[PDB]
Design a protein around this ligand. Structure first.
Ligand code: HEM
Ligand code: HEM
Ligand code: HEM
Ligand code: HEM
Lengths: 146, 141, 146, 141
């Protein structure tokens, strides 16, 4: 659905407090540790044998910054999430070959990273507004899959 | 399969919830009803207000069951046998719902114990909650 | 993607040979037997304790006819599958409360029913054309979920 | 969990594939590569032509492994241990792919044995293939 005014306030006020570089590095590292098959898609970033390797890989750290910066452009296009992400959907499908079920797993890991970094702000209703955003971004990244 | 390291990780993080089973369980239910409103169809009889007596009482039963599962982590099929019959056969809960609650449990630990839920502990606790969910969806007939 | 001319020929030529009433009754019965939680959504059709009950339930048999007739309207709107199914998507979401992962499971059961009824016709390439149709119909029925 | 009736159903339907392991396995691979073309990224070295020697040889290994799993249906974790290490740890196959192949195996039995794959037999064979898939995605680390 459209975001209502209360959902928008939750998302905009919280995103302004997020350290995107730190949260993005954390989120990408956690997805490769928690879902180890995802390492296959990134096997050009180096060996990722274990959590120690992943946490000390500068390529993983820098890529996670770009991914969460990209995700954070949703916050400025809440009316047009599917259209904003259509090229990146195509790029994941055709160039990176990523299975679209994986987008939902990274959205669940971003919620956990946000919850841990902003516990007083991540109220029941704030969480519900962010669960709707990650569900829409994951859907937009799956949309140009043919 | 949960390793020896996974089993120790799950015990360590679960010990933080000692003394808090009702509180953390109530919060995990409130987050599931709000973030995934489609789960409210299983609980038509519940007062869905914040800290309702029904939600606090139900939250405490859920976390108590998880606490017993942590203590019997080597035999989850035996520890959760009655609950698998209730959810799968009597309530016919759609299996997608166990993922929503497992996610809301992780969020409750991230909020109360952010440093304790490190990347390796997160991986172990996610493996435990999938294992619990797999026993609870094992008896559909 | 758009259906190409070879995919269209496969779908149109095969659908013209399908006994929709028989295949629809079979498909609905198999989904309630193979995925027993789906019985909760239909608990107004009667008791569905076991496969014997489900195979002898006239309401299940008649409903499966309507579902496969509805699915078969996709064959006449291959250019507009999402738009043709938008109301039925809304009705599943709001009135029936069906979780959208379930649409993919019924699409996989329709492929099996078609394979068993038309084995000489259900070639490797014919199967691939039908796998693309069921993937698009399942997506169209999930699309008005908000 | 597979019941005693499920185990007998799986043995009965699997006996129809006796003598046909290479043929049925080749067909199941050809249907997975065509219907789910994204699975071809795991097999870059394969000739993807119809009845290629590589696809017939690979199909026969897959069905032979399933045949051994049917004969050891009471201990799938032990019967499939080496294959779980290969798929999960060495090949890092995304778990969504096991559903595509399990579906293509059912389609191959529907085509060759349509009356034998009745609704109750379908339910048992679907339960067996999920159980195989769960052992093969159990060792991701
Ligand atoms: C919130 C969801 C996601 C967003 C916003 C996102 C965004 C991006 C961006 C911005 C790039 C860089 C594109 C470029 O300019 O080349 C990228 C690359 C990539 N992404 Fe994602 N991504 C997401 C989820 C995922 C997931 C779940 C996977 C796999 C498990 C994945 C795998 C990749 C891969 C393999 C690359 C190429 C890496 C490289 O060559 O540097 N993405 N993504
Ligand atoms: C970690 C997962 C879960 C655990 C450990 C769990 C545990 C429990 C326990 C201990 C009970 C009480 C049984 C009794 O009083 O004897 C219960 C009841 C119930 N559970 Fe769950 N549960 C879980 C997941 C779910 C999910 C995902 C749903 C639906 C979205 C659900 C719906 C119910 C319902 C509707 C009841 C009956 C409540 C009542 O009659 O008041 N459960 N569960
Ligand atoms: C190919 C996918 C599907 C199609 C084309 C389809 C089509 C339909 C149609 C045409 C109706 C009748 C609407 C009306 O006029 O009232 C209906 C009703 C319904 N469908 Fe579906 N459906 C599909 C999948 C599913 C699935 C997977 C479920 C649940 C597991 C489901 C559950 C229901 C329920 C509960 C009703 C209401 C039954 C009644 O009250 O008679 N549908 N569907
Ligand atoms: C029922 C499920 C499956 C079974 C029983 C199975 C069985 C096997 C067996 C027996 C081997 C040969 C190992 C050896 O020669 O020692 C193998 C190799 C392999 N499997 Fe699977 N497999 C299954 C599913 C899958 C899926 C879903 C994929 C990917 C989509 C996959 C990809 C591979 C690959 C890439 C190889 C290596 C082939 C080569 O090097 O030529 N398998 N599998």
């Amino acid at each position: 659905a459209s975001f209502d005014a209360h959902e928008r306030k939750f998302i905009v006020d919280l995103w302004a407090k997020v350290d995107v570089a730190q949260c993005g590095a954390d989120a990408l590292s956690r997805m490769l540790i928690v879902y180890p098959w995802k390492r296959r898609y990134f096997e050009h970033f180096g060996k990722m044998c274990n959590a120690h390797d992943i946490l000390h890989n500068s390529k993983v750290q820098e890529h996670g910054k770009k991914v969460l910066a990209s995700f954070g452009e949703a916050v400025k296009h809440l009316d047009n999430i599917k259209g904003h992400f259509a090229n990146l959907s195509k790029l994941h499908c055709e160039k990176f070959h990523v299975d679209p079920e994986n987008f939902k797993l990274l959205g669940d890991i971003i919620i956990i990273v946000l919850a841990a970094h902003h516990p007083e702000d991540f109220s029941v209703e704030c969480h519900a507004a962010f669960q709707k955003l990650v569900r829409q971004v994951a859907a937009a990244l799956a949309a140009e899959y043919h | 399969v949960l390793s020896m390291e996974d089993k120790s990780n799950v015990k360590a993080i679960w010990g933080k919830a000692s003394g808090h089973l009702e509180e953390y369980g109530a919060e995990a239910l409130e987050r599931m009803f709000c973030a995934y409103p489609q789960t409210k169809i299983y609980f038509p009889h519940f007062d869905m207000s914040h800290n309702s007596a029904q939600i606090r009482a139900h939250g405490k039963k859920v976390f108590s069951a998880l606490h017993e599962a942590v203590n019997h982590i080597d035999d989850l099929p035996g520890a959760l046998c009655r609950l698998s019959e209730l959810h799968a056969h009597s309530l016919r809960v759609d299996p997608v719902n166990f993922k929503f609650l497992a996610h809301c449990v992780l969020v409750v630990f991230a909020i109360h114990h952010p440093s304790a839920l490190s990347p390796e502990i997160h991986a172990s606790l996610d493996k435990f909650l999938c294992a619990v969910s797999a026993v609870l969806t094992s008896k559909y007939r």
